[PDB]
Design a protein around this nucleic acid. Structure first.
Ligand SMILES: Nc1ncnc2c1ncn2[C@@H]1O[C@H](COP(=O)(O)OP(=O)(O)OP(=O)(O)O)[C@@H](O)[C@H]1O
Ligand SMILES: Nc1ncnc2c1ncn2[C@@H]1O[C@H](COP(=O)(O)OP(=O)(O)OP(=O)(O)O)[C@@H](O)[C@H]1O
Ligand SMILES: [Cl-]
Lengths: 411, 412
DNA sequence: CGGGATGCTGGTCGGACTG
DNA sequence: CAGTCCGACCCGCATCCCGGA
């Protein structure tokens, strides 16, 4: 299929992307290679069918065009492809398909003769909250599913090696099914691009997925949800996702590598419905990306404020050790609980099922005495997001106690 | 030049190493490829001169031999090499040289069709001490120079990539001069081998060497000095055997410019080892490495240090505040005074008086008082020769002397 | 300095080859 | 007769050498 090759198609002539460079004189140079199909002294339009079956007396011609900054163009002689290769085998190529292969050959080699390490993948700062600025952009944010697998970044070392490394900046062993497909895909795409994704196979626990990724069965898939260039880390998230989609338009025959579906939302409610939907399809949640977010690598565990994860909260039990009130605004005068981690380190937990009138009334009517006799030392189940690395649970809310009490009635 | 190719030479026929395999029946199979040079219907001996100039009407013949466990041998047809390649260019090969290239081709491909990640480099436990067990082995230990550079392990990923990683298990950028030569060297050597060495360029500070190794834009001026090798499937292999394999690897290619084997020295006693250490310091190296002859390769998994290597280097210098004194507990150190300095973190450690006899250490610990020490030694600054920092206390610490010099034997 | 030619390794294809 | 080896064919990466500026 055409458009699997990089470049623009126009007036029946397909041209690969111009490769620009500087010369000794300091002027700008451009070099372009182009493919055309000639039958009966006529350039005919290129069709997807002629990649499977030849057309009678059609000849493919390849030529290059070269010119300095605002100078006259120079053309090469036409190399005529009149015949496919591996002509007897199942490897056989059509004339047209073989010409594009030779064109992409000369193109990739020209790029190599006239032209990179591991970058830590970007990390998500926000958790079940979407900053209002996400919907103040000219473009709507993107929503993606949140797969509970193992994270991996792909790149090509320039010598030709495909690098698959981890969130801990560690190269992966095995995954030959994926590295094989990445080697194929990198012939058709810019070799400097980093592909950022998740190793995963659906309906499988993370212990199994992490088991295959770390160990040295070729059954995992690679779901790419982002890309970036080392020299253009400020490129907006939106533009990075159009480029990523042009990369995957090229190859749709891949079996183990997949682009992650992108969803547009205009408000928080649209986003929370997609998060609901992905949980029922068995995923871990949703990812929200600001449309103008740059690529902020996670150097020294840095989290970007232009992504948000939408996940369900974790469950745990803690010992209630004290109570207090909120400080800021509406939370001022509203009661908060103080649980404690086994390290005697303590944290605030928010009553989830009480109105603000209750939180005000409860903090007014409670005494150190009545809390020592009825609440101290009780076990309290706490929905929380993450543990601050401090170990403190973040965004902690009290679901309820084991032994059920009504705190409104305590005397 | 012949011995640049793996295999044995005998009766004028060179044969590459047998590649063994299993069959469905479970019997052992062996496959061998061999090269011979025939002139006038006679196998003539292969010479290094035939790699630069052809011999008239000599033809090189390549053939394979294949046989199952204790079964009759099967022979292939002879592939005749009558002509070198790149015949007009400076790339030209002789007939004989071209045949060995084609043999090593079929050999490497057969090995690939019938057949690995980072392992943390092994770490040195002992410091300016050589255990007596090093000299109880059937073979004498090996001493090497200690280059103050950056450590690196080389291996080949099997797909064809050359991996150069660090002690931190992190792949290196740049070093194209070194990776280029490793790719050429790995055509002739077992592809399963790890080469363990040091990135270095002599008479240059470590800030510069580390500067070129870490950055992705080095000037391609560093060298790679290999001092060990290992196989993932045979980490119990004794140090001695690993160094012959390593030396056979480097016998092959001596044309390399950026890759070097580290000179091996035999010693029979501690004094022999310390003279080599002295000698390397005067040539500007950091010290010596001592390897027990039967030491396996123990990778530094959780910063694990192997008790079958020892470094011999000069000690570091520092100043600490004297805060207390005590005595030794074990044997000859019993009743002998020790000082107690303190790190800025208020953590304290024992320092040994270096220039006092044991009679002095006994007398001092008997005659000293908390009073006399609080008034003349407490809080003073004391220079301390030490080895390393315990992962923070200085280890093997010795007192050179104080800033303001006092004679502690005369304190009253 | 751009590119054809040459040779190399790794990939796939297809036809023996042999227990 | 089931892998099991291997020549053949392509292709990306090197180097060598000769136009092409
Ligand atoms: N489409 C996606 N976009 C971004 N991240 C995704 C996506 N699908 C799955 N993920 C995973 O979610 C993680 C979000 O980054 P974050 O810093 O939140 O990780 P974490 O909190 O340490 O791990 P977890 O999110 O599992 O608790 C990434 O590491 C990635 O592996
Ligand atoms: N011939 C050699 N054999 C072994 N190690 C060598 C040799 N030459 C230099 N070295 C270096 O000495 C180091 C000894 O390992 P060790 O665990 O003692 O390192 P370290 O103590 O953390 O670093 P340093 O030795 O610089 O203090 C190796 O990492 C290696 O880089
Ligand atoms: Cl040396």
């Amino acid at each position: 299929m055409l458009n699997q090759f990089p470049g623009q198609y126009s007036n029946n002539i397909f041209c690969f992307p111009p490769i620009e460079s500087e010369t000794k004189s300091g002027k700008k140079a451009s070099w372009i290679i182009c493919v055309q199909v000639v039958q009966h002294n006529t350039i005919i339009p290129i069709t997807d069918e002629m990649f499977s079956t030849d057309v009678k007396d059609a000849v493919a011609e390849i030529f290059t065009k070269f010119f300095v900054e605002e100078g006259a163009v120079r053309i090469s002689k036409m190399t005529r492809v009149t015949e496919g290769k591996n002509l007897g085998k199942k490897n056989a190529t059509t004339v047209v398909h073989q010409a594009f292969k030779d064109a992409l050959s000369k193109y990739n080699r020209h790029a190599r003769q006239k032209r990179r390490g591991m970058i830590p993948p970007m990390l998500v700062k926000y958790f079940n909250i979407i900053p209002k600025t996400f919907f103040e952009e000219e473009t709507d944010p993107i929503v993606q599913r949140k797969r509970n697998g193992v994270r991996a970044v792909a790149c090509q070392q320039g010598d030709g090696c495909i690098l698959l490394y981890s969130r801990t900046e560690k190269e992966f062993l095995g995954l030959d099914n994926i590295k094989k497909e990445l080697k194929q895909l990198y012939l058709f795409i810019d070799v400097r691009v980093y592909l950022d994704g998740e190793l995963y196979l659906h309906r499988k626990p993370l212990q199994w997925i992490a088991g295959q990724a770390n160990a040295k069965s070729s059954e995992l898939h690679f779901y790419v949800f982002d890309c970036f260039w080392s020299d253009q880390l400020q490129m907006p998230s939106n533009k990075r996702q159009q480029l990523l989609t042009n990369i995957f338009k090229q190859k749709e025959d891949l079996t183990f590598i997949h682009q992650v579906e992108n969803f547009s939302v205009k408000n928080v409610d649209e986003a929370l419905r997609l998060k609901a939907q992905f949980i029922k399809e068995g995923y871990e949640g949703a990812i929200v990306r600001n449309a103008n977010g740059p690529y902020e690598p996670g150097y020294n565990n840095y989290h970007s404020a232009h992504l948000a994860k939408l996940k369900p909260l974790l469950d745990a039990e803690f010992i209630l050790v004290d109570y207090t009130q909120g400080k800021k605004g509406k939370d001022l005068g509203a009661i908060l609980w103080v649980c404690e981690l086994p390290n005697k380190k303590r944290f605030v937990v928010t009553p989830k099922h009480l109105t603000y009138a209750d939180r005000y009334a409860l903090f007014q009517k409670l005494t150190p005495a009545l809390f020592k006799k009825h609440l101290y030392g009780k076990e309290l189940t706490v929905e929380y997001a993450e543990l601050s690395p401090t170990g403190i649970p973040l965004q902690a809310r009290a679901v309820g106690f084991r032994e059920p009490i009504n705190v409104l009635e305590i005397i």
